[PDB]
Amino acid sequence: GTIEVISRENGSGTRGAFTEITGILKKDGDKKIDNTAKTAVIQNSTEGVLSAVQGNANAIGYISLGSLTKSVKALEIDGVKASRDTVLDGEYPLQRPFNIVWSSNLSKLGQDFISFIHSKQGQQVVTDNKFIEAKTETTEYTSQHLSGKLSVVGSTSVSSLMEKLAEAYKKENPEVTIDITSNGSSAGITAVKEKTADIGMVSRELTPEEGKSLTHDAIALDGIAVVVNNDNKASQVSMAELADVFSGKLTTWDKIK
C-alpha cells in the first residue's frame, strides 16, 4: 500500500538532524530547502510519532534511538541494526554528536562542571536519559561546594540533557546557578567566542572556522531510529531508499524488498 510519511514539526531539532543526515535538507547557497514529502503528516513529539506509527500499518517515522519501544519496529539502515554498539563503532549512520564547546575563557567553575560531566556520575546521567556514552575512560568527581553562575548556550537538541546534568551537578553544588539558553548551535559557538557563555552546546560537527580557538567534546551520541508498524514485513532500507521515502519519491511499500 501507500506509504504514510510521519514528519516531526517544523523547527524540531530531530527533524533538522534527520533531514541534514539523509540529504533531504539541501543548501543551494545560504538558503536551505527541506525536501520532506509534501504529503507527510506532522507529529509534535517522539510520543506522537510512536503513536502514529503504532496506529497505522503503512506509516514510517523517525525518533530518538533511546525512545524506541516494542510498540514499533526499527528498520535496519544499510543492513545495520541500530544499537549502542553500532552507534559507538560508527556502523550505524543516522546519528549525531551532542558537543559541548569552550575556550581559554572557561572559568574554574565551568571547568569543575566539565569534570562532573566527564565523571562516572555525569556519564550515568547521559545513559540513564537513554543517550549513548562515547567515552570509555571514566574519572571520579568530588564536590568542591562551589559558588557562582554558569551560562550554557546553544542547540535546543542538547538543552534537555544539559538540564539533567545541571540538576545532578547542583545537587552536589547547591550554591551554583546554571542558566541554559536554547537558541541554536551557531549562536552557542558565537556566545562562547564573545565570552557571553561559559559553555556552548552544538548538536553537530563544528566547521574548521567554528572550531578555531575552541575545544569541543562529545558528551553523548544521539542515534535516530527509523520506525515502522510491527505489521510491516519490511526490515531494512538503504540510505538512498530512506531519502526517497521521506522526500516522497518512493511511495508504495512493495518497492521496499
Find the part of the chain contacting Cl ion (CB under 5 A) among 2-10, 99-107, 148-156, 235-243.
2-10
Q: Does residue 39 interact with Cl ion by CB under 5 A?
A: no
- Residue of the chain from 9, 47, 85, 194 that contacts Cl ion (CB under 5 A): 9
In angstroms, rounded to a whole number, what is the distance separating the alpha carbons of residues 15 and 11? 7
| CB closer to Cl ion, 45 vs 235 | 45
Instruction: Using the minimum distance from each CB to Cl ion, give the nearer residue, 42 or 106.
Output: 42
Angle at 95 between CA 41 and CA 204, to 5 degrees: 100
Using CA atoms, how far apart are residues 116 and 145, in angstroms rounded to an integer? 12
Could you tell me the three cell numbers for 136? 570509555
Q: Between residues 8 and 73, which has the closer beta carbon with respect to Cl ion?
A: 8
**Beta strand 215-228 with 175-182: parallel, antiparallel or unpaired?**
unpaired
Q: One-letter amino acid identity for 76?
A: E
253: DSSP letter: G
In the bound complex, what is the minimum distance in angstroms from residue 225's beta carbon to Cl ion? Answer: 21
Interface residue with Cl ion among 10, 143, 160, 196 (CB under 5 A) is 10
**Closest to Cl ion by CB, 9 or 205:** 9
Residue 10 CB, nearest approach to Cl ion (Å): 4
State in angstroms the smallest separation of the CB of 52 from Cl ion.
Answer: 14
101 close to 188: Cβ distance less than 8 angstroms = yes
**Smaller CB separation from Cl ion, 40 or 192:** 40
User: Where do we find the cell 515502522?
Assistant: 228
Total number of residues that touch Cl ion (CB under 5 A):
3
What 8-state DSSP symbol labels residue 249? S
Hey, is 111 helix, strand or coil? Answer: helix
Residue sitting closest to Cl ion (CB): 10
Provide the binding-site residues for Cl ion, judged by CB under 5 A: 9-10, 42
